[PDB]
């Protein structure tokens, strides 16, 4: 409302910089944050501009006439337009003696203003035949000209999406007079704006190739680039411009002028390039090595295509594999997308004859990673993965991965190892580690080459360096295959995992391995089962990531279910034994999510577990009810039953009923929707069992009373789409087991009454499982009707059906028309459909009088959608009709 004060303003600045107290020097930020957001912004921006006592004021002025302009330019009328237009452009003339950094944000001024100014006819011309021949209003023109196409693909400035179309040809009849402009501009502090320049207009693709062929700015380009005089930043400016030209190119052929003097451009490179690695400019080997990379990636397709000949030239992957030597990783890293995306391409084309010409290439480059993954002989500990280096080593894993195949993984695999048999630490750790990414790849197992290495890797010794020990512990973990197809090298495979299981910093990887080795090699495990099972009975004592602990227990659960079924059920007794005694020692969350592992994964081919189960069955009851407020905790409480239950074969039906009435008893003081959600795995996994039927119908009706309770609140449902999610999960999985329990249970009119209600909800994932209960709701009396009990299922969707079927019928429509988002109009139609596969006749009638509660669009549009509705032939029609229909609301 209230114009801020003049002098405040200035006040706010002078304290925004150099208030000494820190928090004084805060709130004047939000202060005049907060004046930015205001209406006020704007004649306080001009004002400040014109003004203009300080640097420091100017600054927030122009950042302000920039923001204003790009966030809240709805704010200005039509004629506002022009006055804004000169009273800008006469303050980047007035401010351009001042600090670039004030300038530049004017520049993105004038430059978003005109974009979205549809009046200021031809914007191109009329700055540069205003300001072109001033000379000193030459920087501040290129500066306006370089951000403009920049903002053209602002996400901070919306200006519809055909006026954006509307914006790039105009720029095209205009491109002439900018490079024009650009070319005379030329006759160093000077050249890398006007190259900067050309690079964004470069940038959305509105130069013309031919014309940018034969042209001055093009071959100048490259001349400053073979200088090795040009500075730091010339050298930026226009190793970008190159990457900007060639990027532009999007055909090849179309551009072969252009594509042409960029390709025979770059290539004379190559001796700047080495004048800039003989001395240590580290910047522009950056730069070539991006020209290098762009030129690659621009001709991948003629490489590909026509190797060695004309622009499929050879000498391009010859360089980049120049970069790939230059000790510094940072230099190659830059080719790995190209690189990668070279071998996608290879591998998309299945000709061995396109593979032998790169496999070369490859290999050179493979073996120059290698080199790059080798750590500093300082290095102390294990190889992290969390640095800039260690992510780069992770990176070089993936590229190897990717690029395997063009080699061979066998073929490379004993390369590297026969690399050592002619060596320090960290050339063994880097070969161990390349050898690790591929040693799942190599797959064939008939080569004895792995035992090799196998027996290699176990024999080193423990005083090897740390790192060694950790990558070597990974490669074993790699090797879980090899060793099952060789039986003997169990023991010796696990006594060397176990050693580095000890020790602390490799405690992770280790864990990891034997997990490989436990899951592949089960049944082998025999014998180990009690070394398994006693480092489980100290989980804790190891250094471990929860990843790595619970795919220990995992591991163990696994080779336990391979033993023979006697023995079994006292081993998982004990397995299960130090969680259980820590459970009745005491949140249980590490504990419990521990027992959910072992009987998860616990499940021999025959039952042992019964007895084992029924019993650690009364402590997970207690720890339950104990923490039954927790939903966190809970849940997991759910999770590790849901397993138990599972773990059992069949006669498992026996422990349901008491957790069922335990689930029951605790959802009615607290409505977790998880007990639904575990109830719909009962239900779908017991329903079908004659047995169970009357049981999980109880659980259902029993369930239902808090759920209805709980969603019958003020916005009961908008609050727990949660509960409406599994509750229908739950009435869906009694449709597809066992649906005329459910229909002739009393339950199902409230669940229904409740289905039609919910479809008002937003919730994505909600109205996904009540529109499909609703469907196959219905389904049910249409589906099957060879089966006895069809007619049954007809009669009991028809009561149903007809006592609720013109209000589904009516909110199903309301809902697509006002309520909720497109998304539900297949589903919604899908429902439409299966209600007129059992009533046709009587759905007209139900369909007739929705449309007539219409709270525009005429009477025809509503006459002809229940016609396209009640005389389609597919469900398909129904979801045509529906979006069309919608289309209108």
């Not at 957001?37 to 640097?55: G, M, N, P, T, Y």
């Not at 400053?224 to 730091?232: A, I």
């Not at 009396?781 to 089966?787: F, K, Q």
Request: charged fraction near 20%; proline fraction near 4%.
């Amino acid at each position: 409302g209230a114009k801020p004060t003049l002098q405040l303003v200035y006040q706010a600045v002078q304290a925004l910089y150099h208030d000494p107290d820190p928090s004084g020097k805060e709130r004047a930020s939000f202060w005049l944050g907060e004046l930015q957001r205001s209406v006020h912004a704007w004649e306080i921006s001009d004002q400040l501009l014109q003004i203009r006592q300080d640097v420091e004021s100017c600054y927030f002025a122009a950042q302000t006439m920039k923001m204003k302009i790009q966030t809240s330019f709805y704010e200005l009328p039509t004629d506002s337009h022009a006055s804004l237009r000169d009273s800008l452009l006469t303050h980047i003339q007035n401010l351009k003696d001042l600090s670039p950094v004030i300038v530049t944000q004017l520049a993105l001024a004038i430059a978003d203003l005109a974009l979205q100014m549809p009046s200021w006819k031809g914007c191109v011309q009329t700055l540069v035949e205003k300001y072109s021949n001033d000379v000193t209003s030459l920087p501040f023109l290129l500066e306006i000209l370089t951000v403009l196409p920049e903002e053209v693909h602002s996400r901070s400035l919306r200006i519809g999406a055909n006026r954006r179309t509307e914006i790039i040809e105009d720029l095209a009849f205009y491109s002439s007079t900018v490079v024009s402009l650009l070319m005379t501009c030329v006759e160093e502090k000077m050249l890398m704006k006007v190259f900067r320049c050309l690079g964004s207009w470069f940038n959305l693709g509105v130069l013309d190739s031919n014309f940018m062929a034969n042209n001055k700015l093009l071959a100048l380009l490259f001349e400053v680039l073979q200088q090795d005089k040009t500075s730091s930043n010339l050298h930026e400016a226009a190793s970008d411009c190159v990457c900007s030209a060639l990027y532009a190119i999007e055909n090849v052929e179309t551009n072969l002028p252009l594509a042409m003097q960029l390709f025979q451009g770059v290539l004379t490179l190559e001796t700047a390039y080495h004048m800039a690695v003989a001395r240590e400019d580290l910047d522009k080997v950056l730069n070539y090595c991006r020209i290098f990379t762009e030129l690659c990636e621009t001709f991948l397709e003629k490489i590909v295509c026509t190797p060695g000949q004309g622009l499929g030239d050879l000498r391009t992957l010859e360089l980049l594999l120049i970069c790939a030597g230059h000790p510094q990783y940072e230099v190659v890293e830059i080719s790995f997308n190209f690189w990668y995306r070279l071998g996608e391409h290879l591998y998309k084309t299945n000709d061995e004859v396109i593979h032998g010409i790169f496999k070369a290439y490859i290999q050179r480059l493979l073996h120059a990673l290698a080199r790059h993954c080798q750590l500093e002989p300082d290095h102390e500990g294990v190889p992290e993965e969390t640095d800039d280096f260690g992510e780069f080593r992770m990176r070089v894993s993936d590229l190897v991965k990717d690029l395997i195949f063009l080699i061979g993984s066998m073929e490379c695999f004993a390369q590297l190892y026969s690399t050592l048999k002619e060596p320090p630490w960290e050339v063994t750790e880097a070969v161990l580690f390349i050898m690790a990414a591929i040693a799942k790849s190599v797959d064939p197992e008939n080569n004895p080459t792995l035992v090799e290495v196998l027996e290699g890797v176990v024999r080193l010794p423990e005083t090897v360096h740390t790192a060694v020990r950790y990558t070597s512990i990974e490669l074993v973990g790699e090797m879980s295959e090899v060793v099952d197809r060789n039986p003997q090298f169990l023991d010796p495979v696990l006594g060397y995992l176990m050693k580095g299981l000890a020790e602390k910093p490799l405690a992770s990887a280790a864990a990891k391995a034997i997990h490989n080795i436990c899951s592949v090699c089960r049944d082998h495990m025999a014998q180990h089962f009690n070394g398994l099972l006693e480092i489980a009975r100290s989980l804790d004592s190891f250094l471990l990531s929860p990843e790595a602990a619970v795919g220990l227990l995992k591991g163990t659960a696994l080779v336990l279910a391979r033993l023979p079924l006697d023995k079994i059920t006292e081993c998982l007794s004990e397995l299960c034994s130090v969680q259980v005694m820590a459970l009745k020692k005491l949140d249980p969350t590490v504990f419990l999510d521990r027992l959910a592992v072992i009987f998860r994964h616990t499940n021999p081919i025959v039952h042992p577990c019964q007895k084992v189960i029924q019993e650690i069955w009364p402590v997970l009851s207690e720890t339950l009810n104990k923490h039954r407020a927790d939903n966190r905790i809970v849940e997991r409480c759910c999770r590790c039953l849901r397993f138990a239950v599972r773990c059992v074969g069949k006669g498992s039906a026996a422990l349901l009923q008491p957790l069922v009435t335990q689930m029951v008893n605790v959802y009615h003081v607290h409505q977790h929707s998880c007990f639904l959600y575990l109830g719909s795995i009962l239900v779908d996994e017991y329903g079908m069992e004659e047995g169970c039927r009357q049981g999980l119908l109880d659980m259902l009706q029993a369930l239902c009373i808090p759920t209805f309770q709980l969603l019958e609140q003020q916005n009961g449902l908008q609050n727990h789409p949660d509960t409406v999610d599994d509750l229908f999960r739950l009435a869906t999985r009694f449709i597809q087991r066992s649906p005329v329990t459910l229909l002739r249970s009393q339950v199902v009119i409230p669940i229904l009454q409740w289905a039609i209600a919910s479809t008002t909800l937003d919730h994505r994932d909600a109205n996904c499982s009540v529109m499909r209960f609703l469907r196959d709701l219905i389904h049910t009396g249409v589906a099957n009707d060879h089966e006895e009990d069809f007619e049954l299922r007809k009669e009991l969707i028809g009561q149903v059906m007809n006592q609720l079927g013109q209000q589904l019928v009516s909110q199903l429509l309301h809902t697509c028309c006002f309520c909720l988002p497109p998304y539900t109009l297949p589903d919604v139609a899908e429902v439409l459909w299966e209600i007129m596969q059992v009533d046709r006749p009587t759905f007209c009638r139900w369909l007739e009088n929705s449309l007539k509660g219409l709270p525009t669009v005429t009477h025809k549009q509503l006459t002809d959608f229940h016609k396209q509705v009640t005389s389609a032939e597919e469900c398909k029609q129904v979801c045509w009709a529906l979006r069309d229909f919608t289309r209108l609301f």
